[model samples]
Target: HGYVASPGSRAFFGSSAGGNLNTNVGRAQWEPQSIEAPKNTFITGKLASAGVSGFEPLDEQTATRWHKTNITTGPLDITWNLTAQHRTASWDYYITKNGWNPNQPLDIKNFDKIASIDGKQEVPNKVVKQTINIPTDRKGYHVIYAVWGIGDTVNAFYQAIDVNIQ
Candidate 1:
């Protein structure tokens, strides 16, 4: 129930390509079956059962997860590609504090809700676009968490991106 079989879709569990930047699956990072078995009804539920309290890097086990970008310029444009789209409810965005640790798993206390959008429509082979203004009070390395809520199903897709604020 939690797994999506669409090609070009990064909605897997325990990996960056899968849009999971929350759990520290360790050696089981690439092992999809390890985390995909839960089949939770919602994104928050999935994280709760996996002992993931907050958002982390998309690829915590690798180096490239931390993307170098400039949020100081203006609103950041983010996109989520959907190969086989589904009915969506909302697109939420969250960001970590300035001094948050990148090496540690994120906790709910470490982030603040930045933006959210109404996604009450079907997304068929389309790209969802969102523009968010980075918090001016925060600088340096930070994590941006995105959640795509599927209205017709008991599941949601999660994505975390590490950005180096300049």
Candidate 2:
């Protein structure tokens, strides 16, 4: 028998471990709640999971400020291949404003590109994972989101991370 995974379960939404900031093996369930790390308002980090939905754009600036301290030089291994279930999704990294723009389209108005990690990966309801090599020259707050679009609308879940060159 075959089953289709929900848009929430797709790789675009993030790795299988839910892109959590801390590891609590027992409390392994994905919580959509945002975790803000301690740092200056200018640099900070955050983590989110699949079980979460909807974000307050107003809080983005505050969140970015808090994550200023949690930067890391990571081979940031993100694996969204939990239990080998079939799912579909796409993901991207961006820098966005704290307020929604009425002038721009839903996709264009919200974000400006810093990079595209999905260089070229073919995914169709199969195990998905990616490793991002952190660049030394870059320093700033970045938001990562998993986007799953089905039919008409697209849903996004995210976390923020700050990188400071050592």
RMSD from true fold, candidate 2: 11.1
Per-residue lDDT of model 2, residues 1-166, tens digit only: 0111222221212323434322231222233223222211122212222332332221333322322333444455443322322222344544444453323323333544444443233333444455555444444443333332221223333344332323
At residue 22, give the lDDT of candidate 1: 30
In order of listing, the candidates' clash counts read 2, 12
Candidate 1 — worst ten consecutive residues by lDDT sum?
Answer: 1-10
If scored against the real structure, what TM-score would every candidate get? 0.62, 0.36
Best-fitting candidate, scored by TM-score: 1
lDDT of 1 by residue, 123-147 (tens): 5346656688788878876666666
TM-score of 2: 0.36
Stretches of candidate 1 off by over 4 Å are 1-67
Q: Which residue pairs collide in model 1, if any? A: 12-18, 41-154
Task: Look at candidate 2 and tell me the lDDT of residue 158.
Answer: 38
Find the candidate with the highest lDDT and give its number: 1
